[PDB]
Amino acid sequence: APFVAPNVQGRVIKESGYNTKTFKPAYVKPKHVIDPNMIIPRQPGEALGTG
């Protein structure tokens, strides 16, 4: 606090305010196509020879 000789009035002290922040989410969208080519060859848990 400021020192002030007791004859004079005194002194006004300033102040301050504040700020704001805002954000927006990004957007993610993957996909897959499913051909017959990704279906027809053999998967590993299938017996050899036949299917």
Place this chain on the structure above:
Amino acid sequence: AGLYTTYQLLEVQRKLKTLPAFFLQWFPRQINFQEDMIAFDKVIQDVTRV
């Protein structure tokens, strides 16, 4: 003695070497098959991508 020296017998010392199982602790499963070969599948599944 005389015709032949008499003997007493004591207990027979039977050493019996073995080869005890150590590396078979890592081979737990027994799978029999009457077929020609055994095939496997190794599949690497790359997942960790953004």
